[PDB]
Design a protein around this ligand. Structure first.
Ligand code: HEM
Length: 147
């Protein structure tokens, strides 16, 4: 159970510009794991240009979906069991498109980077710990989807 106010007050800041913050998360994620980008080519409907896929409405829509999912976790920070079935279904969908479960740990590192970029020293160790616990719960629920 992550401290709710630390999660809510930090998420509120990133919610002011969710697409811009999501782009920052993905930029770190791709630098840490370059193999992830070719998975998005199918949604883009073209395999010739990674850069065109990165700037595509289809890629932006995925960023919007990711921010909505994190928003649902933040809304349910007090009880994440409500989203257990949905997160397992999300885990199934990612396994279906070739995503490895290990890449979700890399997404967690990118999320902390996005938050530190947005908040600076306001991203306190307690805030970082709260986000680590919340994200760890989200990936533990999504992990059951892989089975
Ligand atoms: C590891 C990086 C990620 C990759 C490679 C990835 C890949 C994908 C792909 C390829 C799709 C499209 C599936 C399809 O319809 O064919 C998708 C859908 C989706 N992704 Fe991700 N994703 C990643 C991270 C995340 C994260 C961290 C979340 C939030 C937990 C998320 C939330 C979603 C959602 C909500 C959809 C909904 C599409 C649907 O209706 O099924 N993604 N993902």
């Amino acid at each position: 159970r992550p401290e709710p106010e630390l999660i809510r007050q930090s998420w509120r800041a990133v919610s002011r510009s969710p697409l811009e913050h999501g782009t920052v998360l993905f930029a770190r994620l791709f630098a840490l794991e370059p193999d992830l980008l070719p998975l998005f080519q199918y949604n883009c409907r073209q395999f010739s240009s990674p850069e065109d896929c990165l700037s595509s409405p289809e890629f932006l829509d995925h960023i919007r979906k990711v921010m909505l999912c994190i928003d649902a976790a933040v809304t349910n920070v007090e009880d994440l069991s409500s989203l257990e079935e949905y997160l397992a279904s999300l885990g199934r969908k990612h396994r279906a498109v070739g995503v490895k479960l290990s890449s979700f740990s890399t997404v967690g590192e990118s999320l902390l980077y996005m938050l530190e970029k947005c908040l600076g020293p306001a991203f306190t160790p307690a805030t970082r710990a709260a986000w680590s616990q919340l994200y760890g719960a989200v990936v533990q629920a999504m992990s059951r989807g892989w089975d």
